[PDB]
Every structure is written in structure tokens, then in C-alpha cells.
Homo-oligomer: 245 residues x 4
């Protein structure tokens, strides 16, 4: 009934969008969910999961700062014990054409999407490699293989895939799986913030014929986090309705 | 609790090995399973499933002949109703170096592994595209990106991945998902034939440090067959403990 | 002065389109070219190369038939000596939706594009693995990763990529390189035969903004065939102006 | 004749190893070469290219500082005219296991390998988009798809590949090609430091049976930088004797 019962999970950027969708599917499978986010709306997201009957806790955290990541994993374990699942979802966009991208927009996107994902992966690796069990699921983007106006975003997401495949080689023998999910075009506050015509152009590229939901990504994460996906490691699973960006 | 309940699934080459493991997982999820295979032992395989408390039926069929594939879907529907899931696993080996592969061994591997997967996929498409729903899951091989002494096998499995991505672009808008699985080194009777010393050397190369089971491939098939994996389409998922052949 | 000077090369389907473009560039680099094709127009193509000051010979041949492929290499070696370069370009199209592709259109495309490419590669392997030197360049398609209405073509081209990687692993230690080229959309008689709206839709996908020329593919073949590309093996190079089909 | 005559090329980190090998091949093809590196030995490198009868110049430059990258392109064009070719070879290693990598070793590798490549790519894009012609060749690593003890290096090289494909989509219409090269195990003065028993293990992973040379990478750069490779764009070409890291 609940393939993730008795498992603690940390989901970064789970205050809204895809992150909250993953927290909802993990919580539904009986997992204790730690909502890690820099926005105080994460408390409304945790209170929403507890009201549905699940066990959830919000922990304010800027994954770009190592001291806050160390504090995140410390409080999470003092709250729901050992962390068995890590979902690196936290991400941001500062789009610009290569010839216009500012050094500031470059630094912020790489510091959060790439270094941020590194600092979290590291705290999970230090623990999971000793316990001989663990699940690391990184959210990348279909943009990891190129996308106009996303020099900094494609670089960070492509970097997340490289790390995912490196972590697989170092933690696989420790009974840990590290996999990446590349969501195509999902319906969230970020995608609803783009202009009308931009929405239709993207949906016209989706063979399924519609923008995915945050739970579509959550269903794939819940599977990789289960014991049934123990032989899937270092993979990149596209959840974009067959879209080829 | 029974995600595949009320769904009929056809699994080719499921008399023994990986195909039977996939049949056991689909059955465990309360799915009516059809075991299609030339091997007569398939009758004892379907019986083993009816003994576990599931509904199963063996159909002696040669997927290389279109007239027998047309009979497979006809006989499968009048029994358990509309076919919602198709698992193309049937795949034989006739290994030989490129400079010595006989024209006969080539034709046998291609006619069964590639043309066979096409004939089954075609019959599933004619039906699923009208019912506006369906699941096609092709079992290909880590050998699709090359492997010594497998020119005919690498060609066939690489071809299966090519059709998989093509079917995705033609059946996605009809609500049908077409995905492929590439198993690594799976511990089965057929594989427990090579020298034990070569087998231990092969396992030392798997990052996970152990050979997978037929159910490992099944757990992934059961997920792609669920409604929760409706947005995963045209994907190649490796089930080899993070191994790169 | 000329990189491929003193080298004999066989180019299948070099009577027109990409094949003749490849033959023109190889000849420009001082390579003795063997125009292998099933159309008698290859005799005009070979004469056009001899009139340009290069050495060329046409040999009628259906790569689908092994006895005719064996006769091709025999006549090619007694004519210009040992074959140092093999370019598998010969290919056909019998496009149709998965639910309508006839068994005849399936057999013909797989027998030419896949089995035909194999029979040629096999004759090159038998000779090159003994001479300790060689070059095998297979023309695949950007459709190897899927394309609407090309279930048989994608399967055949994907199969060639799989074989390209298998051959690499078996002949790399012999000093032979096996590489594949995936042309995007090249301006030829076949491509100029499709409707005008299809031409604009295909060209609108090319970031470069135009359909490539036959010599663009030939320039890449001339490089892989040189000694400078002795450390490139088992690669899939796209020559489609950055098109992502 | 020489395919790169009258062309100005910038090769970062070309004072030694692969970088200097790339400069030698570009010089041999008649291209003016700007050696950009923090290593003062870059003067002896440029002088060695002038002794061979080519036009070479050394410009001390820290690619992590945008003001020095802006001065590099300014001083480079004032001396040898418009920059037609940009080779991003600059790279460093600060290897460590995921659970040990210091924040400092992470920052220096990302600041030089990823941000450094970005700053140079940006100065090239700003100039090449107005001229309507140009070549950007990024040297990534076989480590972009993962490698033990290289979380930071695999992240920076995978990121370079991500940028490569993004720049392709934004500069293809402007007549500019952006490609990446992934060298496998290359023999350089920066690799003959490990014991031979370590060298043998790495070589047994190379199907070619031997480690490559700096010029094997240079030959591929000279081709992509030629007018004949104008239709190759957004590609990742492996130069590792068919080795799969
Ligand atoms: N939505 C889409 O269509 C696609 C998005 N993605 C990725 O999916 C992830 C989530 O996407 P959305 O839900 O649309 O994003 P969103 O912007 O709607 O929500 C992201 C959440 O991450 C949090 N966050 C951002 N930076 C953070 C940091 N440094 N530390 C902690 N929390 C931080 C924000 O507070 C926010 O709650 C991102 O990594 C995004 O790049 C991937 C491809 C497609
Ligand atoms: N033209 C394009 O845009 C693209 C073409 N390709 C591939 O490039 C190759 C050449 O394409 P095009 O020049 O446009 O085609 P084409 O039809 O103009 O020329 C192909 C040549 O192959 C020969 N041929 C066909 N079957 C043969 C057989 N069984 N034995 C011997 N010769 C045979 C034909 O006589 C013809 O001369 C084909 O393999 C094609 O699939 C792939 C990507 C795109
Ligand atoms: Cl700036
Ligand atoms: Cl920040
Ligand atoms: Cl949702
Ligand atoms: Cl499970
Ligand atoms: Cl033979
Ligand atoms: Cl034979
Ligand atoms: Cl039919
Ligand atoms: Cl530190
Ligand atoms: K994949
Ligand atoms: K490639």
C-alpha cells in the first residue's frame, strides 16, 4: 500500500511547483517529508501535507550556502531520524542570450542550480555511504542538451547530469542510487509567468499534446526512491510527454 | 494497492528468464497476463501465475509470422478483453564476429528480435490508437550501443530503440506511451551458463557490485505500465546497476 | 598535398546525391574511387570523376545480395588494389505510419539499409583486420532517434549505429576505425522530390537556415578517412547544421 | 593548400599539453595563433610556433576575470586581426570524492573550466555574430558523463557541453559553428607522472590499444575550424580510440 513507509525524504524547493508535487507523491507513499526551501511559503506547504495526514516539517534553507545545508541535514535527522531520500529540485532561471548574459546572472544561476545541488548531494553522500543505503534524485532540465537564451541554465543542468553519473560510480557499491529527472514543460507558477504565445509554442513541441503536472514528476521520483528501482542508477529519465527540446 | 488491476498485458518470450520475471511483477499488480512464446514451457509458466492467484494464459506464437501475431491479439482479447499493455521481450542470440557472422544467423536474430518487435507493435498501434489509451514497453539490451561478437544483436536492439522513439512521435497524441528498457547483467538460467570465473569478473565491473534479477526489469515495466508514468514517452531506461557496457 | 593520396575507396550509392558528393571529395583528396551502385547512372558518375583528372570505376551491385557484395570487393581490388576505405551510403525509404507499414516495405528497407550495410562491413572487416589498417564510414540518419512515418527507416539507421559501435570494439585494436555520419537534411534528388510545404517545414528546423550540400557530408568523410582521424572510433557525427529532428 | 590560411585563432591554456598540440596543428594549417594562458611558458610556446615559420603571439591571461578576457580579444584582434577561431582548452583538476571535495576545490574548478569557457565564448559571440562567420571549439572531457573523484570536473565539462549546444542554437543562423571535443586518455608531460601499472590499466580501457597524442585532438580541431565543417554544429566528438570512460 505504502512502498515508502518508514523513509525520511528531503525535497529542496518543495514550497511550490514541481517540488511540492514530489512532496505530495512521497507523502502519499507514507514517506516523512522535509520541505527544504528558501521561501517561508514552505511552512504553508508543510502544514498542507500534515493536514492531509502525512508527517511534514519546513526547514528554511538557501542550498547555495554550505552552513545552511549542514543545518538542513542536522535538523532533518533530529526531527525524523536518518534521511533515506534526497530530491534536489531547487532551481532558478536568469535567461539571456550568450552575448548579453551578465556576470551576475551567470554567478547566481551556477551558485544555486550547480553548487547548491553539489552541497546537498555531499551531505547526503557523507551519511548514506556509511549507512549502506540511500536515494539521491536530481531534477535537471530538457535544456541540459541546449536551449536558446539559457547559456547559464543549460550549463548548470548539464553539470547536474555529470555529477549524477559521477555520484552513481562512487556510491553504487554502497547500495545507493543517484538518478536525474529531466522534466520537459510542467505547469507551475514559473511556466504560468511566461507570455500567452510562449505557452502555445512550447505545448506545440509536446507529442502528448499538453503541459505535464507537478505530480507527473512526483510519480517518477517515488518510483526511483522505492526498493524496486534499486538496479536503476546514473540514469536520466525525461518526463516531458516525449518532447525533444 | 493494485495499480495494474483491470488491465490486460501481453508479454512475448515470457516462458522463462527475464520475460517470466516481468510476467510475475505485472501479475503481482493484479494484471491479466498473456504469455506469448514458441517455448512449450510457457504453459507451466502461465499455470505458476494462476497458482499465485492471478489470471494468466499461454499462447504458442511465433512473432516472426504476421498471421500468428494477428491471431495472438485476437485470441488474447476474446479471453481477457482489450490489450492495454504490450511487453516486447522475445529476443534470441546468435553471437559471432563481424568477419564470420553467417547470413543465416543474421536473418534469424533480425527476423525475431527486430521484425518480431515490429509486427507486435503494429498490431498494438492499430488498436491502441483507436481506444485513445495504451502502453508499449520494448525490452532492448545494454548491447544497443555496441558489444563484441554481437553485430546482429546490437543491430536488432539498436533498431528496437529507433522504433520506440518513432512510435512515441506517432502515438503520444493518442494517449499511448512507447518506452524501452535496457537490462544489464541479469542473473537467470540462460546467463548461469558462462564460466563462473568470467561471471565474477563481469559482476566486478557492475558499480552496484551484484547481478540484477528478472523482477528488477519487471519493477521498471510495472511502473511504465501504470497511469502515473503517462508523461514518460520515448525513453530508454537502463536496469544494469549503473553499468556502462 | 592530398591527404587520401595512394588510397582506394568504395562508396555505395555514389551514383547521385550524398554518395556522389562523397566520391567527389574523396577524389579531390587523390583517392581512387569505386562507384558501387545498383543504378547504371553510376557509370556516368565514374566517367565524370575520370574527366576531372581522378581515377574512378563503376561496379553494378545490389548490397542486399551477398554474392554481388563479394564480387564488388574482388573486382575493386583487382582494379585499384587493396580497399583502404569503405563508405556505406546506399539506402532507401518506404515511409508509412506504424499502423499501415506493409510487411513488404519493412523487408525491403531492412534488407537494404541494415543487412546491405552489414554484408559490406563484413567484406571490409575480413580484409582490413589482416592488413592492420582500414576505414569504415556508415551513413545513418538523424532519424536513428525517431521520426514520424519512418518505423522501418529509423530501425535500419539505428541498427547501423549499433553495428558501428560493435565493429569499433572488434576492429579498433587492428588499427581500423568504424564511424557513422548522421546527415540532417541534405539537398538531393530524393529530398527535392517531396512537396514544397514539407521542404520548408524541414528547413525551418535547421538552425543554420538551409539544407546542406552533398559535399558537406563528403568533407566529414574525407576527414574520418585520413590518418589525422585515427583516434576517432565508434562516433556518431551529425552533419545537419545543428538540426535536432 | 593549407585550409586555415589568413585565419586568426585563440587557444586558451595552450602553453603546454593538449592546448599546445592544438596550436601546432592550427599553425601547420597556416592559421595565426594567439596562445592565451596564465603560464609564463606561453612565450616559449608562441616562440616555438614562430621558429616553425608561423605567426604566433602569447598573451598572459586569467580567463576567470572578464576584464582580462576582454583585453585578450582586444589585443588579439589589434595584432592579428579578427578572431575567426576560438579554442577553449583552459582546464584544471582538483579531484576528490563527493564526500571530501572542499568548497575551495569546487570553486576553482568551476571558476576556470566553466565560467572561464563562458567569458571567452561570450567575447567570441559578440564579435562573430556581427561578422556572420566564426568557429568556437570547446575541449570538454570523457568525464562529462561521469568519472570517479571528479564531481567538480565532470560538472564543469558537462556544463561546457550544455553551453556548446546552446550557443549552436543562437549562432548557427549567424554562420557560426559551436562544437565540443572530448579527449580520452592523451599522453602529455602532464600525464607521464603516474606509474606504468596505472598507465596499463587506463590503456586496457582503450579499444585502439594505445594512448592518444596532443596532435590527435588538434587534427579534429583543425577540421571543425575549416570552411568544410560549416554544417557540423552543436556536436560532441570523442577523440579517445573508442574508449568509453
Ligand atoms: N517548470 C518547468 O517546466 C521546468 C522546470 N525545471 C526545474 O524544476 C525545478 C522546479 O521548477 P518549478 O517548480 O517550475 O520552479 P518554481 O520557481 O515554481 O519553484 C522552485 C522553488 O525552488 C525554491 N528555490 C529556488 N532557489 C532556491 C535556493 N537557492 N534554495 C532553496 N530553495 C530555492 C523556490 O523558493 C521555489 O519554491 C527547477 O530546478 C527547475 O529548473 C526543469 C525543467 C522544466
Ligand atoms: N538526403 C538526405 O537528406 C538524407 C539522406 N540520408 C541517407 O543518405 C544516403 C543517400 O541519400 P540520398 O543521396 O539523398 O539518396 P538518393 O536516393 O538520391 O541516392 C541513394 C543511392 O543509393 C543507391 N542504392 C539504393 N539502394 C541500393 C542498393 N540496395 N544497392 C546499391 N545501391 C543502392 C541508389 O541507386 C542511389 O544512387 C541514404 O542512405 C539516405 O538514407 C540520411 C539522412 C538524410
Ligand atoms: Cl557583467
Ligand atoms: Cl543566492
Ligand atoms: Cl500537480
Ligand atoms: Cl517497490
Ligand atoms: Cl563469412
Ligand atoms: Cl553465410
Ligand atoms: Cl496492416
Ligand atoms: Cl570546505
Ligand atoms: K535515458
Ligand atoms: K556524438
Amino acid at each position: 500500500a505504502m512502498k515508502l513507509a518508514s523513509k525520511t525524504a528531503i525535497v529542496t524547493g518543495a514550497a511550490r511547483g514541481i517540488g511540492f508535487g514530489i512532496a505530495q507523491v512521497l507523502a502519499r507513499e507514507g514517506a516523512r517529508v522535509i520541505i527544504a526551501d528558501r521561501d517561508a511559503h514552505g511552512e504553508a506547504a508543510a502544514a498542507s501535507l500534515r493536514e492531509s495526514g502525512a508527517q511534514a516539517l519546513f526547514i528554511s534553507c538557501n542550498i547555495a550556502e554550505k552552513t545552511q545545508v549542514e543545518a538542513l541535514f542536522s535538523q532533518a535527522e533530529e526531527a525524523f531520524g536518518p534521511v533515506d531520500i534526497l530530491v534536489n529540485n531547487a532551481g532558478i532561471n536568469r535567461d539571456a542570450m550568450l552575448h548579453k548574459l551578465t556576470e551576475a546572472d551567470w554567478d547566481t544561476v551556477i551558485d544555486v542550480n550547480l553548487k547548491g545541488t553539489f552541497l546537498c548531494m555531499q551531505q547526503a553522500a557523507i551519511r548514506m555511504r556509511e549507512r549502506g543505503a540511500g536515494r539521491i534524485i536530481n531534477i535537471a532540465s530538457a535544456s541540459w542538451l541546449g536551449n536558446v537564451g539559457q547559456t547559464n541554465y543549460s550549463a548548470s543542468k548539464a553539470g547536474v547530469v555529470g555529477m549524477t553519473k559521477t555520484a552513481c560510480r562512487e556510491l553504487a557499491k554502497k547500495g545507493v542510487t543517484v538518478n536525474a529527472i529531466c522534466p520537459g514543460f510542467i505547469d507551475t507558477d514559473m511556466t504560468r509567468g511566461v507570455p500567452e504565445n510562449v505557452w502555445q509554442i512550447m505545448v506545440s513541441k509536446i507529442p502528448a499534446g499538453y503541459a505535464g503536472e507537478a505530480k507527473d514528476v512526483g510519480e517518477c521520483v517515488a518510483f526511483l526512491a522505492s526498493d524496486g528501482a534499486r538496479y536503476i542508477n546514473g540514469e536520466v529519465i525525461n518526463v516531458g510527454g516525449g518532447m525533444v527540446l
